[PDB]
Design a binder for this molecule. Structure first.
Ligand SMILES: [Mg+2]
Ligand SMILES: [Mg+2]
Ligand SMILES: [Mg+2]
Ligand SMILES: [Mg+2]
Ligand SMILES: [Mg+2]
Ligand SMILES: [Mg+2]
Ligand SMILES: [Mg+2]
Ligand SMILES: [Mg+2]
Ligand SMILES: [Mg+2]
Ligand SMILES: [Mg+2]
Ligand SMILES: [Mg+2]
Ligand SMILES: [Mg+2]
Ligand SMILES: [Mg+2]
Ligand SMILES: [Mg+2]
Ligand SMILES: [Mg+2]
Ligand SMILES: [Mg+2]
Ligand SMILES: [Mg+2]
Ligand SMILES: [Mg+2]
Ligand SMILES: [Mg+2]
Ligand SMILES: [Mg+2]
Ligand SMILES: [Mg+2]
Ligand SMILES: [Mg+2]
Ligand SMILES: [Mg+2]
Ligand SMILES: [Mg+2]
Ligand SMILES: [Mg+2]
Ligand SMILES: [Mg+2]
Ligand SMILES: [Mg+2]
Ligand SMILES: [Mg+2]
Ligand SMILES: [Mg+2]
Ligand SMILES: [Mg+2]
Ligand SMILES: [Mg+2]
Ligand SMILES: [Mg+2]
Ligand SMILES: [Mg+2]
Ligand SMILES: [Mg+2]
Ligand SMILES: [Mg+2]
Ligand SMILES: [Mg+2]
Ligand SMILES: [Mg+2]
Ligand SMILES: [Mg+2]
Ligand SMILES: [Mg+2]
Ligand SMILES: [Mg+2]
Ligand SMILES: [Mg+2]
Ligand SMILES: [Mg+2]
Ligand SMILES: [Mg+2]
Ligand SMILES: [Mg+2]
Ligand SMILES: [Mg+2]
Ligand SMILES: [Zn+2]
Lengths: 117, 213, 112, 51, 109, 169
RNA sequence: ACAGGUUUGGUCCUGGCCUUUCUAUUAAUUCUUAAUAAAAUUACACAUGCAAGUAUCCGCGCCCCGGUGAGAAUGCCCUCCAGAUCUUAAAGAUCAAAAGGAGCAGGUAUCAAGCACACCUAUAACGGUAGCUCAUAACGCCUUGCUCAACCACACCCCCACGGGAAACAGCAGUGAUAAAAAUUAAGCCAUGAACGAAAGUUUGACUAAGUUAUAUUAAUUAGAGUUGGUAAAUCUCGUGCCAGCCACCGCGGUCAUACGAUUAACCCAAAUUAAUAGAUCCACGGCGUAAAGAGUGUUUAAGAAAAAAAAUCACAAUAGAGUUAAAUUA
RNA sequence: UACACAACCAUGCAAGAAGAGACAAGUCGUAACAAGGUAAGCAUACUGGAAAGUGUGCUUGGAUUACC
């Protein structure tokens, strides 16, 4: 529909199943609904691991870099998937979250060590 | 769209003219528009409360026009700085006032709009720009005997690498793209950083209308 | 070369209906439309206003219309390019001789 | 190229048409040579009757 | 009909179903105005229990009370359906057994 | 169908089997033929048979027939550039007109292949969505991934109710 | 449609109605637990709670998501795009208003005429032509969201919203009235989308995870409903006696009722089974002497077929005028 | 600022008028079906409690039984 503003954004459309998510990485308007109209579907992300224990992430890089060079904004999970794939640099939020997880482990090991004695 | 039985809606077009007349006739003056209740931190005009992080700089500092109303020619050619700039940027960042237009409706004369020349981190811009965030309570005035001392800045070169290695997958994309064409060159691909210079969040953005060329 | 027309009918061939308007010809363009049920093509007519700056086309002329780059009015969006067949005065485009229906007015075997 | 080829085929068919029209013209002259001698007989009998 | 006539007339479309006595609704809640007895047509012979009711749409219609024996007086709220009785001419509604004021058929004890 | 002389020419197969695709320049086709004489028999059979086959695959090209106007049958193509392509037909047969028109102004097999090869690109096999545009709707139906809880119930350790019941205690 | 029942003493043909198939709502009877999907009477009026915030002030967003189908035959599809937004030096990309049109597009012609709906000059003023649409359906009337990754329209009403009624849930929950129609006045932003901020981060009745509901499917922890004359699977004994009553059509009941009510038995479905109402499907590429249909006749317009060649015109009561009377009858 | 302003229509009710149809047993005739006892019917006009009768043309959806 006609909008007053908005911008092209590569995001994840949560079109899936109950207790079973499945994201469609699409490039849509920022004023459009999540599962609504889009311009062109890029890829697909399966959050749940399959029988082989792999989270299937599918990226159409040839259209992703085209829309990025045309001016498409990116979301935080999209940049996270690109950083995990290696098409984009690793996100500072992923780096700091891994550091925080390491600090939580470093606190829990000392707590479990001081609990036994 | 275009139909033979469309109706000539005149009220919708009359209300546009009425609202456009009201916008300029009942245009709120900036003196009462930027007013502030220093006890509850609430704007009397709009009705919004200031953020929690701005409560100290309102009660302990002053704004630009509040220290510019006590100047002979409203500070022509004078330099004004900001507390946040003096706190974060060790480099001299000031504003060379070229023209000031205060609001005459104010009873204390502490509001107005001005233009000037911006020198952020020593870099002097040779274009005239309107000064931004005048109603902010962070402006500070530098005396006359320090006008030459505060401007003393050492132009030092930057140490940012001019070329950065590509991400792994994108680098392998070029390593496999140029290989199929018969290019035996094993040179490492680099990513340019010249046109990727970005200004920090403290850099004020222009307010003038951008002209399409 | 910035001269475009938003209409779909870039070039059309039709018959002249009326010439009562000054410097304007009323052309009836007939196309073939498929019947969704009978699967047969039937003749669908359509009225097109054309500008005749010379006022030369009469009722019954098979005329070609070209899309005007800008519509002069809300009804005149075409212009007369060439009168393909004048009523009663037909020139055979293959032999170049005047013909009256099926009979030749001047036989092409007599050059002189 | 295709437009020039079409023009050449049109001119070839035009020459064949001219030859056919000349043959039909001669056949028409033969028909005139039959109808003139029939009408010359049919004319004089009516004039003799009216005389 | 030739092809030109069939193209000029278009393909035949089926007509929409005309609304019956229930105005397209499955059921209708109406108040019983008068309970009486009607007689069937020529071959059959009986005394059918009917009632004139005022439907929720404001229309006053005749319905037929099925089953053997009923306790229905005036000012009784019943639910009628579009069941048409074959023996009674003009009666095209039937009272639903097991509703507000029309209980089920009781067994003779 | 049953009504008509040749009922076969009023079917989707006969209209789809005609391989004549004009170029993007062709706009108008004026066919001028006669209804008498043994010469215009091929043009009359062309108007009777192949005109619907050309008009089916060229819906935007105007086609206009004129009867008993000129002594010689002909075609006249009006292109977008303004060029008028005059075609003479006096003793040509029905098939010769089709092959001559496809030779002068048509689309080659190499031209017709790439258009459908580019149209095929629109439907991507890796995309997901409705059955009208894509091949798969719920990623659950992939043989390796997690089944579709509308078909196979999920285990107890994976449901959000059990997760919020563990988070409660 | 692979069809079947039904017109009559009987047969054939034409011809309508009903049955057999699938789906949705409501009602009745019955009912055990889970998972998934969906929650649908109301454009009638709303108590109460929440649903737009972010931020070193400015600013940016604030029917965007979400809701509804009242109006509009609205519209589907296709060109051109002003304008808005994102990154850049320009240029690019998204939404795309308005202007239109190859074509398509509900019923009704018992809506047949509309009544100014057109054109040229050169300027954005005067003037002159007498036009324009329409049986290929104009102009009217009635009904309706839709062709669905979606699109269109509305936001209390006066089509609009300066102004006037007048204090607005067609946001999430809930409440009155109404109706055959009955989800929680519940928890969170952990995941995604959106808004803000340079950012850690915040908000979000969108959404996520739950609660209720046999509306639908599946698994089993569950067994009741309908029917038993023909169509159409399946009945034994009693009671009534054209009464009570039954039926979708044929029809059954007046003294041995396999058709009513009860019992036995049997058949088909099954946590569902029937009833009602809506649907999907279904009329004519068939016919016109006797069943409905050849319009009382000829000519012409629009429109259509000219697909191979031939022909036009002769006794007798056509018709329109003027004149006359053999038989009979009568003043 | 100067004019028409419920004129025009839609939804219900209506004193009343008229028609059609259904409803197993009424009164008065016997019109049609058999040359239905005057052969039927069409258009039209008049008349009559009623079916109907008659006049002028028309049709056989009637016969004239066929060396009569
Ligand atoms: Mg869901
Ligand atoms: Mg019944
Ligand atoms: Mg009950
Ligand atoms: Mg009968
Ligand atoms: Mg219910
Ligand atoms: Mg704010
Ligand atoms: Mg919506
Ligand atoms: Mg309307
Ligand atoms: Mg644009
Ligand atoms: Mg547009
Ligand atoms: Mg009428
Ligand atoms: Mg509606
Ligand atoms: Mg409004
Ligand atoms: Mg409301
Ligand atoms: Mg609201
Ligand atoms: Mg609500
Ligand atoms: Mg309530
Ligand atoms: Mg419900
Ligand atoms: Mg309730
Ligand atoms: Mg309830
Ligand atoms: Mg209840
Ligand atoms: Mg909450
Ligand atoms: Mg979130
Ligand atoms: Mg967050
Ligand atoms: Mg169920
Ligand atoms: Mg029964
Ligand atoms: Mg018995
Ligand atoms: Mg039965
Ligand atoms: Mg029984
Ligand atoms: Mg029929
Ligand atoms: Mg008949
Ligand atoms: Mg006749
Ligand atoms: Mg008649
Ligand atoms: Mg006379
Ligand atoms: Mg006398
Ligand atoms: Mg009689
Ligand atoms: Mg007799
Ligand atoms: Mg009689
Ligand atoms: Mg008698
Ligand atoms: Mg008689
Ligand atoms: Mg008789
Ligand atoms: Mg009569
Ligand atoms: Mg008489
Ligand atoms: Mg008499
Ligand atoms: Mg007879
Ligand atoms: Zn699934």
């Amino acid at each position: 529909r006609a909008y007053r503003g908005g911008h092209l954004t590569i995001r994840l459309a949560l079109g899936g199943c109950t207790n079973r998510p499945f994201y469609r990485i699409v490039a849509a308007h920022s004023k459009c609904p999540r599962d609504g109209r889009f311009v062109e579907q890029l890829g697909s992300y399966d959050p749940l691991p399959n029988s082989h224990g792999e989270k299937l992430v599918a990226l159409n890089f040839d259209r992703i870099r085209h829309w990025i060079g045309c001016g498409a904004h990116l979301s935080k999970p999209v940049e996270k998937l690109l950083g995990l794939s290696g098409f984009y640099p690793l996100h500072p939020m992923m780096i700091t979250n891994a550091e925080r997880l390491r600090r939580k482990r470093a606190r829990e090991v000392l707590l479990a060590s001081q609990k036994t004695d | 769209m275009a139909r033979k039985k469309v109706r000539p809606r005149l009220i919708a077009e009359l209300a546009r003219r009425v609202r456009a007349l009201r916008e300029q006739r009942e245009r709120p003056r900036d003196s009462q528009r930027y007013a502030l209740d220093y006890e509850t931190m609430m704007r009397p005009h709009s009705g919004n409360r200031l953020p929690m992080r701005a409560w100290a700089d309102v009660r302990h500092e002053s704004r630009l026009l509040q220290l510019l109303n006590r100047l002979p020619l409203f500070g022509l050619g004078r330099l004004v700085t900001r507390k946040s700039w003096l706190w974060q940027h060790d480099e001299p960042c000031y504003w060379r006032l070229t023209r000031v237009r205060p609001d005459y409706a104010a009873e204390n004369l502490d509001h107005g709009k001005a233009w000037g020349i911006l020198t952020f981190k020593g870099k002097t811009e040779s274009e005239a720009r309107e000064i931004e965030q005048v109603m902010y309570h962070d402006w500070r005035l530098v005396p006359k005997h320090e006008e030459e001392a505060f401007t003393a800045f050492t132009l030092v070169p930057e140490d940012t690498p001019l070329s950065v290695p590509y991400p792994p997958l994108l680098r392998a994309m070029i390593l496999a793209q140029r290989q199929k064409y018969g290019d035996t060159s094993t040179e490492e691909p680099m990513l340019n950083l010249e046109r990727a210079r970005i200004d920090p969040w403290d850099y004020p953005a222009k307010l003038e209308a951008k002209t399409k060329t | 070369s910035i001269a475009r027309s938003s209409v779909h009918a870039k070039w059309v061939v039709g018959k002249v209906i009326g010439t009562a308007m000054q410097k304007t010809a009323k052309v009836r363009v007939t196309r073939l439309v498929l019947d969704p049920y009978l699967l047969k093509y039937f003749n669908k007519r359509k009225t097109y206003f054309a500008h005749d700056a010379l006022q030369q086309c009469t009722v019954g002329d098979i005329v070609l219309l070209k899309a005007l780059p800008v519509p002069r009015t809300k009804h005149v969006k075409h212009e007369l390019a060439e009168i393909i067949f004048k009523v009663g005065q037909v020139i055979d485009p293959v032999t170049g001789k005047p013909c009256a229906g099926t009979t030749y007015l001047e036989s092409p075997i007599s050059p002189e | 190229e295709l437009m020039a080829w079409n023009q050449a085929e049109n001119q070839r068919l035009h020459e064949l048409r001219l030859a056919r029209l000349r043959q039909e013209a001669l056949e028409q002259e033969r028909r005139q040579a039959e109808e003139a001698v029939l009408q010359a007989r049919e004319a004089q009998a009516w004039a003799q009757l009216k005389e | 009909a030739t092809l030109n006539q069939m193209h000029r007339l278009g393909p035949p479309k089926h007509p929409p179903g005309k609304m019956g006595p229930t105005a397209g609704r499955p059921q209708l809640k109406g108040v019983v105005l008068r309970t009486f007895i009607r007689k069937p047509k020529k071959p059959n012979s009986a005394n059918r229990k009917c009632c004139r009711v005022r439907l929720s749409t404001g229309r006053e219609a005749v319905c037929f009370i099925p089953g053997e024996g009923h306790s229905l007086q005036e000012h009784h709220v019943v639910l009628v359906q579009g069941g048409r009785t074959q023996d009674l001419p003009g009666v095209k509604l039937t009272v639903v057994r097991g509703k507000y004021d029309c209980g089920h058929v009781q067994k003779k004890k | 169908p049953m009504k008509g002389r040749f009922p076969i020419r009023r079917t989707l197969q006969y209209l789809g089997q005609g391989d004549v695709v004009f170029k993007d320049s062709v706009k108008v086709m004026t066919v001028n033929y006669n209804t008498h004489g043994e010469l215009g028999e091929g043009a009359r059979k062309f108007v009777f048979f192949n005109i619907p086959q050309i008009q089916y695959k060229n819906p935007w090209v105007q086609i206009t027939m004129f009867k008993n106007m000129t002594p010689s049958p002909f075609l006249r193509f009006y292109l977008d550039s303004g060029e008028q392509v005059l075609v003479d037909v006096e003793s040509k047969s029905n098939k010769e007109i089709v092959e001559h028109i496809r030779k002068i102004l048509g689309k080659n097999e190499e031209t017709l292949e790439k258009e459908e090869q580019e149209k095929k690109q629109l439907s991507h096999p890796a995309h997901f969505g409705p059955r009208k545009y894509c091949l798969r709707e719920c990623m659950c139906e992939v043989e390796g991934q997690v089944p579709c809880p509308g078909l196979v119930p999920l285990p107890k350790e994976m449901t959000g109710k059990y997760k919020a019941a563990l988070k409660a205690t």
